Design a protein around this ligand. Structure first.
Ligand code: HEM
Ligand code: HEM
Ligand SMILES: Cc1cc(CCc2cc(CCN(C)C)cc(F)c2F)nc(N)n1
Ligand SMILES: Cc1cc(CCc2cc(CCN(C)C)cc(F)c2F)nc(N)n1
Ligand SMILES: C[C@H](O)[C@H](O)[C@H]1CNc2nc(N)[nH]c(=O)c2N1
Ligand SMILES: C[C@H](O)[C@H](O)[C@H]1CNc2nc(N)[nH]c(=O)c2N1
Ligand SMILES: [Cl-]
Ligand SMILES: [Cl-]
Ligand SMILES: [Gd]
Ligand SMILES: [Gd]
Ligand SMILES: [Zn+2]
Lengths: 402, 400
């Protein structure tokens, strides 16, 4: 009835009873697994809300109390009267933490309870929106001692359009399509860069130009905002023992702040709720810098290293990527900016898995996203079978507003 | 029809072949178990479909011998219960089951498989000389060749041909006065049985285990593999002269001897297949897995790396040099080896071939992506669809 899950490093076995409670449905069938795919009404508002309030009163040990049944009636009454309902502040804080706790592709979830929730549900315009965001960046960055934070903007509601942040992260480097089809800067941000220029951003011509924010208030076009330079903490990349490395002129930013996901809590939808943590070195070193469709620096580094790039069996790619990652950790530690390496990160995820197994009887985890993109079987999560399922509250992908 | 994207290039394909999925898998709309290692008249229906495959692949759908072959297996099963395959069908099916193995990154080679027919086998001594012919043929003085030896299929009331080893070459696993193992911890148990059935234990980390072979309704009988038949490669590193002194070794022939070949409803519990190694199989899993030889820290001490902080990436640095040694040692030994970059690149080519041929390919992302440098290889950026087609290799209960 419940999936049996083996740990092959230790021999451990557990059963994931929490999987049985999966509130929504994923893309696999008994026919065919699609696990590897990146992108897989009053009645049903009431049931989602009822489940969430039940979770909330579970977490405060008031299950089935007077206050519990009063809240249930309050929400039903409000759904009948208005078609929606409003979260209390403590419910919002709990729901945003749960959403992080439930995110299956997050290796950083050992921290889920230490999340700083900024309530911006009273936000009114794109301008007030930008101020809230600047303060989030400032709080989360914290001069290099990064802190996990989420800012929750007003919920989707009938009659009004959504608050949206068009940028996928608060800090992104421009991607300038040049005349042939070769991108200068970050190729993943080609589209959002064009939108910025089309909305009157004066573009630069560097590889590391920070993009402006395109911020959409309800039923308004998007509005462009420049992030103050001294709010965007950045890290020039150098290598502890390859001194030509600094002449590559590579940089990355301190704050990974995902800004295009929808936060769902008890049926309510928050299309704008940017959250930020701190980086794992392989996101920057392996993925952002070596992905053939991103900065794609791997061969240029290998050539500088005097590796033989004419045969693959010399493993020049593995050697060059390892040093790129070394350079990222060293550089961040030098700059005194929070960073975790994939070994530290995957070991603490194992502790998370053990905490969650005791607390809820399992843990949604997407193995292919939890296993780092280099040195996979050298980390303990590689040898841990995982069960992937969708719990709510949740962060979800949503279509781009344009 | 699943939409499948390659993120490196941005290309889209559709897996239309998924629609024909046979033995349903472990996943449901509510939970994905993709990461788990281990998830009679119906014989006619599976026999029918395999024959239909066979004649479609030789441009002979619905012509003469196809219709006729349908009636014979009708008659054979009608009279006796089971049925025998034509020798080419055994060959065509041994190859399709390779072509269908979603966890095999080496499937670009599927069409060049050598099938040794051993269906007329009768006992542990006969097996042993079949296996031995396979080993020496496949090894071929280090110029390795894909081979499968197929032993007699299964029918009720009588026993089963089985190889009690998971592979033909395995290293010993000796427990100690304190639990910890000298040798290979993944074999420890099959070492217990070999010692139990008369074998004299060595004292080494790389003692090649005997070969517990069993014929229907008969207890296993040990067989000592001839030392000249077991091609092995001492591991040395091209620039680290002390690596040789670590005294590490691996064997040349990866020969899987415990899986159940299944063609047209027929079950061959003994059908050992062999190919050649990918270097990460040896260097990364076999030697560096924490429950295998677990040499990673010992190699890092020799490289003077800072094992005190994980952020030195000492594990990654030592793993790459272990893999380099493996590739260098096999090449110096003139023994077929393929690195994970070359292998994954061929798999991409195989996906494109299988797309235009069969309209898709069953692929298990977690096992196709190599255990080091995953995202440096193109398979990482390739979405994949996993499903079960027949003919197929299957896992099966351990014999004992
Ligand atoms: C503080 C340390 C954190 C670490 C080390 C971390 C790590 C990661 C990593 C490596 C991924 C895979 C990303 C990729 O390769 O694209 C990921 C995904 C994700 N993270 Fe975390 N994260 C952290 C904080 C947070 C916070 C604070 C939240 C929300 C409150 C969060 C929510 C998510 C979500 C929803 C995903 C899935 C998004 C996706 O990749 O599709 N993370 N995380
Ligand atoms: C010729 C080059 C070959 C290469 C480089 C290769 C490599 C691999 C690798 C790396 C795996 C990963 C699974 C694991 O390590 O547990 C695998 C799995 C598998 N291969 Fe291949 N292999 C080759 C030939 C063959 C042949 C000849 C057959 C059968 C005719 C075959 C059938 C399979 C099967 C059934 C699996 C899945 C078994 C399992 O994962 O438990 N392969 N192969
Ligand atoms: C708060 C936070 C989030 C993340 C994940 C960042 C993230 C990055 C991408 C880009 C694609 N990826 C291959 C690089 C897509 C995503 F959906 C995504 F959430 N990480 C860390 N440390 N903190
Ligand atoms: C013919 C062939 C097969 C293989 C795969 C080897 C293989 C390995 C395991 C577990 C051990 N693994 C985690 C280290 C289980 C299997 F069923 C299995 F077939 N490889 C290569 N090159 N050729
Ligand atoms: C196709 C494949 O599933 C896809 O590229 C996935 C694989 N694993 C990943 N893992 C992480 N952390 N981030 C990713 O973008 C991906 N991409
Ligand atoms: C839990 C995880 O699915 C499991 O460790 C798998 C992942 N990929 C693997 N790949 C290979 N080749 N061999 C393995 O044992 C595994 N183990
Ligand atoms: Cl990122
Ligand atoms: Cl192996
Ligand atoms: Gd230097
Ligand atoms: Gd020394
Ligand atoms: Zn699945």
């Amino acid at each position: 009835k419940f999936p049996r899950v083996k740990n092959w490093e230790v021999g451990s076995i557990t059963y994931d009873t929490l999987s049985a409670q999966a509130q929504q449905d994923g893309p696999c069938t008994p026919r065919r697994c699609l696990g590897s795919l990146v992108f897989p009404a009053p009645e049903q508002l009431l049931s989602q809300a009822r489940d969430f309030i039940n979770q909330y009163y579970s977490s405060i040990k008031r299950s089935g109390s007077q206050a519990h049944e009063q809240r249930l009636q309050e929400v039903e009454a409000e759904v009948a009267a208005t078609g929606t309902y409003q979260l209390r502040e403590s419910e919002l804080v709990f729901g945003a933490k749960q959403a992080w706790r439930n995110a299956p592709r997050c290796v950083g979830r050992i921290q889920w309870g230490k999340l700083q929730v900024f309530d911006a549900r009273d936000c009114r315009s794109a301008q007030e929106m930008f101020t809230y965001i600047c303060n989030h960046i400032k709080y989360a960055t914290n001069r290099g001692n990064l802190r996990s934070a989420i800012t929750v903007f007003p919920q989707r509601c009938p009659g009004r359009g959504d608050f949206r942040i068009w940028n996928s992260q608060l800090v992104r480097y421009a991607g300038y399509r040049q005349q042939d089809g070769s991108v200068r800067g970050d190729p993943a941000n080609v589209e959002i860069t064009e939108l910025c220029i089309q909305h009157g951003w004066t573009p630069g011509n560097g590889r590391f130009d920070v993009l402006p924010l395109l911020l959409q208030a309800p039923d308004e076009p998007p509005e462009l905002f420049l992030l103050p330079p001294e709010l965007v903490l950045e890290v020039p990349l150098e290598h502890p023992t390859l001194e030509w490395f600094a002449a590559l002129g590579l940089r990355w930013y301190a704050l990974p702040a995902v800004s295009n996901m929808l936060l769902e809590i008890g049926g309510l939808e928050f299309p704008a709720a940017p959250f930020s943590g701190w980086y794992m070195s392989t996101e920057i070193g392996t993925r952002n810098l070596c992905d053939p469709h991103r900065y794609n620096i791997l061969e240029d580094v290998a050539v500088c290293m005097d590796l033989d790039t004419r045969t693959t069996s010399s493993l020049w790619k593995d050697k060059a990527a390892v040093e790129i990652n070394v350079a990222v950790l060293h550089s961040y530690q030098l700059a005194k900016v929070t960073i975790v390496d994939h070994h530290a990160a995957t070991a603490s995820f194992m502790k998370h898995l053990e905490n969650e197994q005791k607390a809820r009887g399992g843990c949604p985890a997407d193995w292919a996203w939890i296993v780092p993109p280099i040195s996979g079987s050298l980390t303990p999560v590689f040898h841990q079978e995982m069960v992937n399922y969708f719990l709510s509250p949740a962060f979800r992908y949503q279509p781009d507003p344009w």
